């Protein structure tokens, strides 16, 4: 029983088969359509306070091996028994079990293909695992975090990486970043009420000042890291400056673009989700992949409830900024657009623009569907925020299941968290 | 319960409690979410063999009159209750019913505003009904249809109207236009290969050639009407030229633009959906609005199945069409929408931007909330093909559902009617 899906511009139709294996979360229902909810808590896997009882525990084990052992194209039958026997009783003795290193590396892997937002995954396999299971002290991740950081800036040439900490045991010892993204800039509420700086950025700021960083009132100012080890009361780290790159922006014909001063990081790390394996919680799993242009030509610098700059660049290209009819709003974004495209490449910093992204994904989606039949997608995120129907994806009818393993959200650390 | 969802551009959030009154006829499950189908059967209002039987009659049609008279500041119990009574009786002896003048106003109106992919919603109120439930002939059909063309029309000051014609008796005798639109441009496979006019139309085109149309091989050839009357087959009837008001494409500032010798016509009209009212199904209602530039600039003359003039248009603007990082895929789609709303501005045609549009649909759906607690809506298809952050609508979540009345899809005529 596959659900037929078209692609309107190529004709291009896939049977899928996959969602059957999905888990029964989502909160449509025959009555509505919530597709276009942003945070739905089917989506996030918030706080425990008892660790997962083991006979709860195990058939969710035994089916993240049997998947594990199922990606094999050469069979291993006998191991795969014995992983099952030794999951069986590790957890019966231990009330849990441990992933191999080969196992997360593929469950990693694995929850990137199964992650419906991201417009990124045919590079699911290019994924440096960076085991931090060990891990028991705050400082301890700091240096692990500012490893992955060099290893994934690479100079420019970024890569991909996530670092795992140790998996939730009871819920009371959760080792998680408290920061959206690995990197991010500050924003302060000025004496007088207005904003300076990233705007979304405005209440955590607050929280690391709470917690004893010193505002420097910037426009672009990397907030510290807060990290709670142990389900200890965070503390902050600042990632060393050194470890930080970041682009000046300017416009390939425009003098004056470089006259609005801005500039952005080159690592996008989101770093405060849970990943879920065979009903394991990682609550401390930051990962990055380099930028689609659109995230800051669009989002970061447009937005009105960001660095909003399409006014004053509208203003700035002598455009008929007083009438919508002018379409003055779409000439702007796509100059700020090449800015940031050829801001990146100008300075050798990677950088991918969404036609060749979205050009990507069809790829990747036909690659799913032929190899598992099936590919959890999720229509409102993976069209760009420019240009929508100049994209494949646009044109592309999808389905949207969450599979594990998976990357949910979580309930912001502070929201939850009892000082002591 | 109600489902509170909310825009993240704003901060204005609502609480809808009227998608409980929706039909729960989406296909969306907990498994997974499938909004992104296009053509949905659960958006479709299929043929039928057999009247409806009065006993799934009665009450949509209760339903309905409850919903008409409800619709009043001012009450009329008496009335009201009597509506119901003459209803009842009615369906009883008759086995169907009549709706009223005003009571098809309403239905019409209130379809519109239930109309999830809608971005045009705001001008629910203003519809000019042509009541047709009398007609009996192809020709007669085409008469109200010519009236109704030229009404909205009104010079290039378009209005919006709906030509209501006779309901659905036992499915064998239904009245449909079999054309998508009224007015649309034909698509033909020329010999050499290639395809001229819109590429969409070549199989709906070689239909009304093999219905004895005459060919002309132009790229903007209006098809002829294909009506079918009392379940007969269909007629042609070729709208009267001075009936089609085109526009001629030109730019602004680029005068070559006028080379591509570009057009398009002036009035968007749905054709072949279905009005459900109380039970009650209308095969036949032509409607139609004013364009949103995005439709023509974006969709019609972008989309690659379709003039697909994107490549030549960037060839003719200098820029790096080798090259996709260039971004001139969205310098191009853009100085095309401007050519768009333009060339309807200077030839005085009514025409809506999408900045615009999507800022009196917000307006709109907060009257909704405050109306009626609730507004379903469709984010997939109320977003623009172009910039679609850059609009506040991206920035809404929304729920989607199906009210009463509503207008369905429906089988093409094509797929399942039986030639005599
Ligand atoms: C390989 C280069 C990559 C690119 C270009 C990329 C790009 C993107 C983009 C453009 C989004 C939309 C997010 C937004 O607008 O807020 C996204 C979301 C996402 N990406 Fe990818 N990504 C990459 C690698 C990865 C990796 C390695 C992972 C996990 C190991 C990942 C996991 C996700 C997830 C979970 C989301 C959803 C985030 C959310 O819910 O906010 N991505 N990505
Ligand atoms: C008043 C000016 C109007 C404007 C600017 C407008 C605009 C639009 C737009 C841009 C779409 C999306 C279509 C697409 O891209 O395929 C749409 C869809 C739709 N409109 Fe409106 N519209 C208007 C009036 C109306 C009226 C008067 C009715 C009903 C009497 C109506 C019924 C619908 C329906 C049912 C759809 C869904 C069409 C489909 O499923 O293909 N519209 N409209
Ligand atoms: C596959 C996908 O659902 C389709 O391409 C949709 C997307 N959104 C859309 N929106 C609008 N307004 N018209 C369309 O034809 C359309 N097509
Ligand atoms: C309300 C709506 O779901 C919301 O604006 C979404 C739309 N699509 C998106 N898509 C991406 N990639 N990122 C976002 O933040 C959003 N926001
Ligand atoms: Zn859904």
Same mark, same amino acid.
């Given at each position: 029983?596959?659900?037929?899906?078209?692609?309107? $511009?190529?004709?291009?139709?896939?049977?899928?088969?996959?969602?059957?294996?999905?888990? $029964?979360?989502?909160?449509?229902?025959?009555?509505?359509?919530?597709?276009?909810?942003?945070?739905?808590?089917?989506?996030?896997?918030?706080?425990?306070?008892?660790?997962?009882?083991?006979?709860? *525990?195990?058939?969710?084990?035994?089916?993240?091996?049997?998947?594990?052992?199922?990606?094999?194209?050469?069979?291993?039958?006998?191991?795969?028994?014995?992983?099952?026997?030794?999951?069986?009783?590790?957890?019966?003795?231990?009330?849990?079990?441990?992933?191999?290193?080969?196992?997360?590396?593929?469950?990693?892997?694995?929850?990137?293909?199964?992650?419906?937002?991201?417009?990124?995954?045919?590079?699911?396999?290019?994924?440096?695992?960076?085991?931090?299971?060990?891990?028991?002290?705050?400082?301890?991740?700091?240096?692990?975090?500012?490893?992955?950081?060099?290893?994934?800036?690479?100079?420019?040439?970024?890569?991909?990486?996530?670092?795992?900490?140790?998996?939730?045991?009871?819920?009371?010892?959760?080792?998680?970043?408290?920061?959206?993204? *690995?990197?991010?800039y500050?924003g302060?509420?000025?004496?007088?009420?207005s904003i300076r700086g990233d705007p979304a950025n405005v209440?955590?700021?607050?929280?690391?000042?709470?917690?004893?960083?010193?505002?420097?009132?910037?426009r672009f100012?990397?907030?510290?890291?807060?990290?709670?080890?142990?389900?200890?009361?965070?503390?902050?780290?600042?990632?060393?400056?050194?470890?930080?790159?970041?682009v000046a922006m300017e416009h390939p014909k425009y003098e004056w673009f470089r006259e609005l001063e801005l500039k952005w990081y080159?690592?996008?790390?989101?770093?405060?989700?849970?990943?879920?394996?065979?009903?394991?919680?990682?609550? $401390?799993?930051?990962?990055?992949?380099?930028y689609m242009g659109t995230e800051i030509g669009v989002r970061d610098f447009c937005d009105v409830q960001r660095y909003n700059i399409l006014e004053e660049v509208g203003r700035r290209m002598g455009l008929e900024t007083h009438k919508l009819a002018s379409l003055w709003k779409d000439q702007a974004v796509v100059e700020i657009n090449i800015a940031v495209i050829h801001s990146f490449?100008?300075?050798?910093?990677?950088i991918?623009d969404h036609?060749?992204?979205?050009?990507?994904?069809?790829?990747?989606?036909?690659?799913?569907?032929?190899?598992?039949?099936?590919?959890?997608?999720?229509?409102?995120?993976?069209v760009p925020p420019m240009s929508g129907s100049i994209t494949?994806?646009?044109?592309?009818?999808?389905?949207?299941?969450?599979?594990?393993?998976?990357?949910?959200?979580?309930?912001?650390?502070?929201?939850?968290?009892?000082?002591?």
């Open positions: 029983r596959h659900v037929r899906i078209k692609n309107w $511009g190529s004709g291009m139709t896939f049977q899928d088969t996959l969602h059957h294996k999905a888990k $029964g979360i989502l909160t449509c229902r025959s009555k509505s359509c919530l597709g276009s909810i942003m945070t739905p808590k089917s989506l996030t896997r918030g706080p425990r306070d008892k660790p997962t009882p083991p006979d709860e *525990l195990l058939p969710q084990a035994i089916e993240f091996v049997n998947q594990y052992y199922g990606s094999f194209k050469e069979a291993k039958i006998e191991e795969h028994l014995a992983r099952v026997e030794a999951v069986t009783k590790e957890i019966e003795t231990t009330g849990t079990y441990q992933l191999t290193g080969d196992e997360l590396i593929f469950a990693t892997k694995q929850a990137w293909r199964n992650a419906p937002r991201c417009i990124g995954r045919i590079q699911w396999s290019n994924l440096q695992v960076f085991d931090a299971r060990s891990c028991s002290t705050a400082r301890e991740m700091f240096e692990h975090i500012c490893r992955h950081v060099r290893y994934s800036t690479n100079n420019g040439n970024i890569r991909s990486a996530i670092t795992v900490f140790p998996q939730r045991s009871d819920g009371k010892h959760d080792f998680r970043v408290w920061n959206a993204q *690995l990197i991010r500050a302060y509420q000025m004496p007088d009420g209440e955590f700021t607050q929280l690391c000042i709470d917690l004893g960083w010193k505002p420097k009132y910037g100012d990397v907030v510290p890291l807060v990290l709670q080890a142990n389900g200890r009361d965070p503390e902050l780290f600042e990632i060393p400056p050194d470890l930080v790159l970041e080159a690592l996008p790390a989101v770093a405060n989700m849970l990943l879920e394996v065979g009903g394991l919680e990682f609550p $401390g799993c930051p990962f990055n992949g380099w490449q100008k300075q050798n910093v990677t991918m036609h060749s992204a979205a050009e990507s994904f069809m790829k990747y989606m036909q690659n799913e569907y032929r190899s598992r039949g099936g590919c959890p997608a999720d229509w409102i995120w993976l494949p994806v646009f044109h592309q009818e999808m389905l949207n299941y969450v599979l594990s393993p998976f990357y949910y959200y979580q309930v912001e650390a502070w929201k939850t968290h009892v000082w002591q």
